[PDB]
Amino acid sequence: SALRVGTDGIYPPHSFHAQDGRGELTGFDIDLIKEVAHRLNLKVEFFETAVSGLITGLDTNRYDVLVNVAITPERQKKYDFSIPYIAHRVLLVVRSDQQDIRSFKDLTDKTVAQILGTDLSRFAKELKSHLVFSHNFEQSLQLLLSKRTDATMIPDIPFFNFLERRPHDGNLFKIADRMKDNSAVAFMMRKGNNKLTRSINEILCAIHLDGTYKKIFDRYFDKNIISSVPGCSS
Amino acid sequence: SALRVGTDGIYPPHSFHAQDGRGELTGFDIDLIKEVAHRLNLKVEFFETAVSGLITGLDTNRYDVLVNVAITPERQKKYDFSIPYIAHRVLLVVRSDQQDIRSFKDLTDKTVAQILGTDLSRFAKELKSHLVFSHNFEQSLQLLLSKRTDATMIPDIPFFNFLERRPHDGNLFKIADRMKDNSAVAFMMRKGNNKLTRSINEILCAIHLDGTYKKIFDRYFDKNIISSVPGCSS
């Protein structure tokens, strides 16, 4: 019996292909949902889709779980989430010599790279920024480097992953601003299978309690920069 | 229409009576669930009940939500939880001149104060401590100070609250040990109460986003000492 998971595998360190993009799907969220599946005695099956098509596949029952989804009011009304399993902080990233962008408000009438069909893309359009649509976070940062855009709103997790992979490029960017709060991130499912949701939850707590959560987290993130969520009790 | 909430009102800063016992119910978790009920146009009705009977009362349908409950896999199997709204850290507290307790393992054959029917009382019993059952955290700590017990396992929130009330007392206690992670705390409901749980989650999100959570949190806690949990994103 299968746990069907939708992802886009061009998003290190969440979901990506080993061997410089040529081998097996791996990443924090990939390893976690695999462990979840393993402990539920389910066969995991992955299905890879461009981010703008991820929620559609969930809606039409092509798969049953999406990974690394930020909880928002509208999504909570329409879908079921797991307990949060990580938190990210939205950053405003610019070239290191940029001077006229000091706040999210400053993005009005500036050129900003975002991913089509994402909430940060929606935010940028609402600020009356000028969008250039990228296919993932690596490309948003490349568009920023190359001067196609003057900023990108990007969560900390993929930004710091880029600095870890490309340290000599780090000096070309700076954080101009950050959201005042971090954001809970969870697995997202269609409403109406409370049973699967409660099962994933119980298993996520088990994974915290036995040290496996910390193992997987420290494989992919630096604990001094990226926030974890609380553990559980027994 | 009512939201029935079970609580024991002798647990500052969570749930306690104003004017040293004579006034209305107040505290962090009380104000929070009042705010949630208010946004749902529900009248709250509180059912004061000793901790040993809180979960019993929920099972008995005497009320519909319990506040300040630690998530455990054994509870996640049997009950619905809201998204977490705070975290605590379990501390092993002894008198500052206690000599032979340096780890939870050292509690075997020690006398320890714990609250009847709690998970931490169960853990003390598993360690083969000798149990002195206490009626609440204040009594746990008073048992310790008066040398009627030699330890108590207590979460940081009520332990700091005791010190805030007694600011020359710092040096009467020491923290001998602490759990390795903090512990997610949520509202707990009967299993299958999925529409109430979803409503509470939506309202908790809304509270995090409009600054209400921060207002309530800061009324009761020192943000440098007590952990909050991640925010929801707009």
Coordinates of C-alpha atoms in Angstrom, one line a residue:
Chain A
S1 CA 0.0 0.0 0.0
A2 CA 1.5 3.3 -1.1
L3 CA 2.1 6.8 0.3
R4 CA 2.1 9.0 -2.9
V5 CA 4.2 12.2 -2.5
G6 CA 4.4 15.1 -4.9
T7 CA 7.5 17.2 -5.0
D8 CA 9.7 19.2 -7.4
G9 CA 13.2 17.8 -7.2
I10 CA 15.2 20.9 -8.1
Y11 CA 15.0 22.5 -4.6
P12 CA 18.1 21.7 -2.5
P13 CA 18.3 21.0 0.4
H14 CA 14.6 20.0 0.6
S15 CA 14.2 17.8 -2.5
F16 CA 16.9 17.3 -5.1
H17 CA 18.7 14.7 -7.1
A18 CA 22.1 13.3 -5.9
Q19 CA 25.2 13.3 -8.0
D20 CA 24.8 16.9 -9.2
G21 CA 21.2 16.4 -10.3
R22 CA 21.7 13.0 -12.0
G23 CA 21.0 10.4 -9.3
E24 CA 18.3 9.5 -6.8
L25 CA 15.9 11.9 -5.1
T26 CA 17.2 13.0 -1.7
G27 CA 16.9 16.0 0.7
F28 CA 15.6 16.8 4.2
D29 CA 11.9 16.6 3.4
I30 CA 12.4 13.6 1.2
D31 CA 14.3 11.7 3.9
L32 CA 11.8 12.6 6.5
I33 CA 8.7 11.6 4.5
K34 CA 10.5 8.3 3.6
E35 CA 11.2 7.6 7.3
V36 CA 7.5 8.5 8.0
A37 CA 6.4 6.0 5.3
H38 CA 8.9 3.3 6.6
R39 CA 7.4 3.5 10.1
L40 CA 3.8 3.5 8.8
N41 CA 4.6 0.3 6.7
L42 CA 3.9 2.1 3.5
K43 CA 5.8 2.0 0.1
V44 CA 6.6 5.6 -0.8
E45 CA 6.1 6.7 -4.4
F46 CA 7.3 10.1 -5.6
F47 CA 5.9 12.1 -8.4
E48 CA 7.9 15.2 -9.6
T49 CA 6.1 18.2 -10.9
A50 CA 6.9 21.9 -11.5
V51 CA 5.9 23.9 -8.5
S52 CA 3.0 25.6 -10.3
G53 CA 1.4 22.2 -10.8
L54 CA 2.0 20.7 -7.3
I55 CA -1.2 21.8 -5.7
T56 CA -3.3 20.7 -8.8
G57 CA -2.0 17.1 -8.6
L58 CA -3.0 17.0 -4.9
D59 CA -6.5 18.4 -5.8
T60 CA -7.0 15.8 -8.4
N61 CA -5.8 12.8 -6.4
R62 CA -2.6 12.1 -8.4
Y63 CA -0.8 12.0 -5.1
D64 CA -1.7 12.4 -1.4
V65 CA 1.0 14.5 0.3
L66 CA 3.0 17.6 -0.6
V67 CA 6.2 18.4 1.3
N68 CA 7.7 21.7 2.6
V69 CA 4.4 23.6 2.5
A70 CA 4.1 26.8 4.5
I71 CA 1.0 26.9 6.7
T72 CA -1.2 29.9 5.7
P73 CA -4.8 30.9 6.6
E74 CA -6.2 30.0 3.2
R75 CA -4.4 26.7 3.0
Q76 CA -5.6 25.7 6.5
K77 CA -9.1 26.3 5.4
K78 CA -8.9 24.2 2.3
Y79 CA -6.4 21.3 3.2
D80 CA -5.2 19.2 6.1
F81 CA -1.6 19.8 7.5
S82 CA 0.6 17.7 9.6
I83 CA 2.0 19.1 12.8
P84 CA 4.8 21.4 11.7
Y85 CA 8.2 19.8 11.2
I86 CA 10.4 22.7 10.4
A87 CA 10.3 26.5 10.3
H88 CA 11.7 28.9 7.7
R89 CA 12.3 32.7 7.8
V90 CA 11.5 34.7 4.7
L91 CA 14.4 36.9 3.6
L92 CA 14.7 39.8 1.3
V93 CA 17.9 39.2 -0.7
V94 CA 19.6 41.8 -2.9
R95 CA 23.1 42.2 -4.5
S96 CA 25.6 43.2 -1.9
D97 CA 26.1 46.7 -3.3
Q98 CA 22.3 47.5 -3.6
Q99 CA 21.4 50.7 -1.8
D100 CA 17.7 51.6 -2.4
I101 CA 16.1 48.4 -0.9
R102 CA 15.9 48.3 2.9
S103 CA 12.5 46.8 3.5
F104 CA 9.8 44.7 1.9
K105 CA 8.0 48.0 1.3
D106 CA 10.8 49.2 -0.9
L107 CA 10.1 46.5 -3.4
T108 CA 7.3 48.6 -4.9
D109 CA 8.3 49.4 -8.6
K110 CA 11.5 47.3 -8.3
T111 CA 12.3 44.1 -10.4
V112 CA 12.0 41.0 -8.2
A113 CA 12.5 37.2 -9.1
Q114 CA 10.0 34.9 -7.8
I115 CA 8.5 31.4 -8.6
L116 CA 5.2 31.4 -10.5
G117 CA 2.2 30.1 -8.5
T118 CA 3.9 30.6 -5.0
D119 CA 2.7 32.8 -2.2
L120 CA 5.9 35.0 -2.3
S121 CA 5.1 35.6 -6.0
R122 CA 1.6 36.7 -5.0
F123 CA 3.2 39.0 -2.4
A124 CA 5.6 40.6 -4.8
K125 CA 2.7 41.3 -7.3
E126 CA 0.7 42.9 -4.4
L127 CA 3.6 45.2 -3.6
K128 CA 3.5 46.4 -7.2
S129 CA 6.9 45.0 -8.0
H130 CA 7.8 44.0 -11.6
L131 CA 8.1 40.1 -11.6
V132 CA 10.5 37.9 -13.5
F133 CA 9.4 34.3 -12.9
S134 CA 12.1 31.8 -12.1
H135 CA 11.9 28.0 -12.0
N136 CA 13.4 27.5 -8.6
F137 CA 15.5 29.3 -5.9
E138 CA 18.8 28.7 -7.6
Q139 CA 17.5 30.5 -10.7
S140 CA 16.0 33.4 -8.6
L141 CA 19.5 34.0 -7.1
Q142 CA 21.1 33.7 -10.6
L143 CA 18.7 36.2 -11.9
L144 CA 19.6 38.5 -9.1
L145 CA 23.4 38.1 -9.7
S146 CA 23.0 38.7 -13.4
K147 CA 21.1 42.0 -12.8
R148 CA 17.8 40.8 -14.5
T149 CA 16.1 41.6 -11.1
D150 CA 17.1 43.7 -8.2
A151 CA 15.8 41.4 -5.4
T152 CA 14.3 38.1 -4.5
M153 CA 12.2 37.1 -1.5
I154 CA 13.6 33.7 -0.5
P155 CA 13.4 31.5 2.6
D156 CA 16.5 31.1 4.7
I157 CA 16.8 27.3 4.2
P158 CA 17.6 27.4 0.4
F159 CA 19.5 30.7 0.7
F160 CA 21.9 29.3 3.3
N161 CA 22.1 26.0 1.3
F162 CA 23.3 28.1 -1.7
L163 CA 25.9 29.8 0.5
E164 CA 27.1 26.4 1.7
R165 CA 27.4 25.0 -1.9
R166 CA 28.8 28.3 -3.4
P167 CA 30.7 30.1 -0.7
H168 CA 32.7 32.3 -3.0
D169 CA 29.5 33.6 -4.5
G170 CA 28.3 34.6 -1.0
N171 CA 29.9 38.0 -1.2
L172 CA 27.7 38.9 -4.2
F173 CA 24.5 38.9 -2.0
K174 CA 23.2 40.4 1.2
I175 CA 20.1 40.1 3.4
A176 CA 18.3 43.5 3.3
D177 CA 15.4 42.6 5.5
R178 CA 13.7 39.6 7.1
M179 CA 10.2 38.9 8.1
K180 CA 9.7 39.6 11.8
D181 CA 8.4 36.1 12.5
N182 CA 9.4 32.6 11.1
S183 CA 6.9 30.4 9.5
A184 CA 5.7 26.9 10.3
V185 CA 6.2 24.3 7.5
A186 CA 4.3 21.1 7.3
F187 CA 3.1 18.2 5.1
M188 CA -0.1 19.2 3.2
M189 CA -2.9 16.7 2.4
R190 CA -6.5 16.9 1.0
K191 CA -9.1 17.4 3.8
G192 CA -10.9 14.3 5.0
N193 CA -8.3 11.8 5.9
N194 CA -7.9 12.6 9.5
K195 CA -6.6 9.1 10.0
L196 CA -3.5 9.5 7.8
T197 CA -2.8 13.0 9.3
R198 CA -3.0 11.7 12.9
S199 CA -0.8 8.7 11.9
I200 CA 1.9 11.0 10.3
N201 CA 1.7 13.2 13.4
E202 CA 2.2 10.4 15.8
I203 CA 5.1 9.1 13.7
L204 CA 6.7 12.6 13.5
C205 CA 6.7 12.7 17.4
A206 CA 8.3 9.3 17.5
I207 CA 11.0 10.5 15.1
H208 CA 11.7 13.5 17.4
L209 CA 11.8 11.2 20.5
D210 CA 14.3 8.8 19.3
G211 CA 16.8 11.3 18.0
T212 CA 16.0 10.5 14.3
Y213 CA 14.7 14.0 13.7
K214 CA 17.9 15.5 14.9
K215 CA 19.9 13.1 12.7
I216 CA 18.0 14.1 9.5
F217 CA 18.0 17.8 10.4
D218 CA 21.7 17.9 11.0
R219 CA 22.4 16.1 7.7
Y220 CA 21.0 19.1 5.8
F221 CA 21.0 22.3 8.0
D222 CA 23.1 24.3 10.3
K223 CA 21.3 24.4 13.7
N224 CA 22.9 27.8 14.5
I225 CA 21.1 29.4 11.5
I226 CA 17.9 27.4 10.7
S227 CA 15.1 27.0 13.3
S228 CA 13.8 23.6 14.3
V229 CA 10.3 23.1 15.8
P230 CA 9.8 21.8 19.4
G231 CA 10.2 18.2 20.1
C232 CA 7.5 15.9 21.7
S233 CA 7.1 14.2 25.1
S234 CA 6.4 10.7 26.1
Chain B
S1 CA -23.5 28.6 22.0
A2 CA -20.6 27.4 24.3
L3 CA -17.0 26.2 24.1
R4 CA -16.6 23.9 27.1
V5 CA -13.0 24.0 28.5
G6 CA -11.6 21.9 31.3
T7 CA -8.8 23.3 33.3
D8 CA -7.4 23.3 36.9
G9 CA -7.2 26.9 38.1
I10 CA -4.3 26.6 40.5
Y11 CA -1.5 26.6 37.9
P12 CA 0.0 30.1 37.3
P13 CA 0.9 31.4 34.8
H14 CA -1.3 29.1 32.8
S15 CA -4.6 29.1 34.6
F16 CA -5.2 30.7 37.9
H17 CA -7.6 33.0 39.8
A18 CA -7.0 36.7 40.0
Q19 CA -6.9 38.5 43.5
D20 CA -5.1 35.7 45.1
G21 CA -7.7 33.0 44.4
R22 CA -10.9 35.2 44.7
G23 CA -11.2 36.6 41.2
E24 CA -11.9 35.3 37.8
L25 CA -9.8 32.8 35.9
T26 CA -6.9 34.2 34.1
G27 CA -3.4 33.1 32.7
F28 CA -1.8 32.6 29.3
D29 CA -3.7 29.6 28.2
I30 CA -6.9 30.9 29.6
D31 CA -6.6 34.2 27.7
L32 CA -5.6 32.4 24.6
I33 CA -8.6 30.0 24.5
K34 CA -10.9 33.0 25.5
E35 CA -9.5 34.8 22.4
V36 CA -10.1 31.8 20.2
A37 CA -13.7 31.3 21.5
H38 CA -14.3 35.1 21.0
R39 CA -13.3 35.0 17.3
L40 CA -15.6 32.0 16.9
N41 CA -18.6 33.8 18.5
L42 CA -18.7 31.2 21.3
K43 CA -19.2 31.8 25.0
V44 CA -16.5 29.9 27.1
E45 CA -17.6 27.8 30.0
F46 CA -14.8 26.6 32.3
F47 CA -15.0 23.4 34.2
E48 CA -12.5 23.4 37.0
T49 CA -11.1 19.9 37.6
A50 CA -8.1 18.5 39.2
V51 CA -5.2 17.6 36.9
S52 CA -5.5 13.8 37.8
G53 CA -9.0 14.1 36.2
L54 CA -8.5 16.4 33.3
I55 CA -8.1 13.8 30.6
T56 CA -10.7 11.5 32.3
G57 CA -13.1 14.5 32.1
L58 CA -12.5 14.9 28.4
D59 CA -13.1 11.2 27.9
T60 CA -16.3 11.6 29.8
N61 CA -17.4 14.5 27.6
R62 CA -17.7 16.9 30.6
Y63 CA -16.0 19.5 28.2
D64 CA -14.5 19.8 24.7
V65 CA -10.9 21.2 24.9
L66 CA -8.1 20.9 27.5
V67 CA -5.4 23.6 27.5
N68 CA -1.6 23.4 27.9
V69 CA -1.3 19.7 27.0
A70 CA 2.0 18.2 26.1
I71 CA 1.9 16.3 22.8
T72 CA 2.8 12.7 23.2
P73 CA 2.6 9.8 20.6
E74 CA 0.2 7.9 23.0
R75 CA -2.1 11.0 23.1
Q76 CA -1.8 11.6 19.4
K77 CA -3.2 8.1 18.8
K78 CA -6.2 8.7 21.1
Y79 CA -7.1 12.5 20.8
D80 CA -7.1 15.4 18.4
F81 CA -4.5 18.2 19.0
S82 CA -4.4 21.7 17.7
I83 CA -1.2 23.0 16.1
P84 CA 1.3 23.7 18.9
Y85 CA 1.0 27.2 20.5
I86 CA 3.9 27.1 23.0
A87 CA 6.7 24.9 24.1
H88 CA 8.1 24.0 27.5
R89 CA 11.3 22.4 28.7
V90 CA 11.2 19.8 31.5
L91 CA 13.7 20.5 34.2
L92 CA 14.9 18.4 37.1
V93 CA 14.9 20.8 40.1
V94 CA 16.6 20.2 43.4
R95 CA 17.6 22.3 46.4
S96 CA 20.9 24.2 45.6
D97 CA 22.7 22.2 48.3
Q98 CA 21.5 18.7 47.2
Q99 CA 24.5 16.6 46.7
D100 CA 23.7 13.2 45.0
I101 CA 21.2 14.1 42.2
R102 CA 22.9 15.0 38.9
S103 CA 20.7 13.3 36.2
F104 CA 17.2 11.8 35.9
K105 CA 18.7 8.4 36.5
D106 CA 19.8 9.5 40.0
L107 CA 16.1 9.8 41.0
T108 CA 15.8 6.0 41.6
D109 CA 15.1 5.6 45.4
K110 CA 14.9 9.4 45.9
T111 CA 11.8 11.0 47.1
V112 CA 10.3 13.2 44.4
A113 CA 7.2 15.4 44.3
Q114 CA 5.0 14.9 41.2
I115 CA 1.4 15.7 40.4
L116 CA -0.9 12.7 40.6
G117 CA -1.8 11.2 37.2
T118 CA 0.7 13.2 35.1
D119 CA 3.2 11.8 32.6
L120 CA 6.0 13.0 34.8
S121 CA 4.6 11.2 37.8
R122 CA 4.5 8.0 35.6
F123 CA 8.2 8.6 34.7
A124 CA 9.2 9.0 38.3
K125 CA 7.4 5.7 39.1
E126 CA 9.2 4.1 36.2
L127 CA 12.5 5.3 37.6
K128 CA 11.5 3.7 41.0
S129 CA 11.5 7.0 42.8
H130 CA 9.6 7.2 46.0
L131 CA 6.5 9.4 45.1
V132 CA 5.1 12.2 47.2
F133 CA 1.9 13.2 45.2
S134 CA 1.5 17.0 45.0
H135 CA -1.7 18.9 44.2
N136 CA 0.0 21.4 41.8
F137 CA 3.4 22.9 40.9
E138 CA 3.6 25.4 43.7
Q139 CA 3.1 22.5 46.2
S140 CA 5.7 20.5 44.4
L141 CA 8.2 23.2 44.9
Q142 CA 7.1 23.9 48.5
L143 CA 7.6 20.2 49.2
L144 CA 11.1 20.5 47.9
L145 CA 12.0 23.7 49.8
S146 CA 10.7 22.3 53.1
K147 CA 12.8 19.1 52.5
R148 CA 9.8 16.8 52.4
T149 CA 11.1 15.6 49.0
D150 CA 14.5 16.0 47.3
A151 CA 13.5 16.7 43.7
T152 CA 10.7 17.5 41.3
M153 CA 10.5 17.2 37.5
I154 CA 8.8 20.4 36.4
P155 CA 8.5 22.4 33.2
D156 CA 10.4 25.6 33.0
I157 CA 7.3 27.8 32.6
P158 CA 5.9 27.3 36.1
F159 CA 9.4 27.0 37.7
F160 CA 10.4 30.5 36.4
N161 CA 6.9 31.8 37.3
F162 CA 7.6 30.7 41.0
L163 CA 11.0 32.6 40.8
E164 CA 9.4 35.7 39.4
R165 CA 7.2 35.8 42.3
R166 CA 10.1 35.2 44.7
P167 CA 13.1 37.2 43.2
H168 CA 15.5 36.7 46.1
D169 CA 15.0 32.8 45.8
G170 CA 17.2 32.1 42.8
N171 CA 19.8 30.5 45.0
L172 CA 17.4 28.1 46.9
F173 CA 17.2 25.8 43.8
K174 CA 19.3 24.4 41.1
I175 CA 18.6 22.7 37.8
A176 CA 20.3 19.3 38.0
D177 CA 19.3 18.2 34.6
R178 CA 16.9 19.0 31.7
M179 CA 15.3 17.1 28.9
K180 CA 17.3 17.2 25.6
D181 CA 14.6 19.0 23.6
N182 CA 11.7 21.2 24.4
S183 CA 8.2 19.9 24.3
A184 CA 5.3 21.0 22.1
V185 CA 2.2 22.1 23.9
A186 CA -1.3 22.2 22.3
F187 CA -5.1 22.2 22.9
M188 CA -6.4 18.7 23.2
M189 CA -9.8 17.5 22.0
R190 CA -11.6 14.3 21.7
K191 CA -10.7 12.2 18.7
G192 CA -13.0 13.0 15.7
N193 CA -13.7 16.5 16.9
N194 CA -12.0 17.5 13.6
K195 CA -14.1 20.6 12.8
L196 CA -13.5 22.1 16.2
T197 CA -9.7 21.4 15.7
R198 CA -9.6 22.9 12.3
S199 CA -11.5 26.0 13.5
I200 CA -9.0 26.5 16.4
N201 CA -6.0 26.1 14.0
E202 CA -7.4 28.8 11.7
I203 CA -8.0 31.1 14.6
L204 CA -4.4 30.4 16.1
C205 CA -2.9 31.3 12.7
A206 CA -5.0 34.6 12.7
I207 CA -3.9 35.4 16.2
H208 CA -0.1 34.8 15.3
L209 CA -0.6 37.2 12.3
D210 CA -2.3 40.1 13.7
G211 CA 0.1 40.4 16.8
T212 CA -2.5 39.1 19.3
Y213 CA -0.4 36.0 20.1
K214 CA 2.6 38.3 20.9
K215 CA 0.4 40.5 23.1
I216 CA -0.8 37.5 25.2
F217 CA 2.6 35.9 25.3
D218 CA 4.3 39.0 26.5
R219 CA 1.7 39.6 29.3
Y220 CA 2.8 36.3 31.0
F221 CA 6.3 35.3 29.8
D222 CA 9.9 36.4 29.4
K223 CA 10.7 35.9 25.7
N224 CA 14.3 35.4 26.6
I225 CA 13.6 32.4 28.7
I226 CA 10.4 30.8 27.4
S227 CA 10.2 29.3 23.9
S228 CA 7.5 30.2 21.5
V229 CA 6.6 28.1 18.4
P230 CA 6.8 29.2 14.8
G231 CA 4.3 31.6 13.2
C232 CA 1.7 30.9 10.2
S233 CA 2.4 32.9 7.0
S234 CA -0.1 35.2 5.2

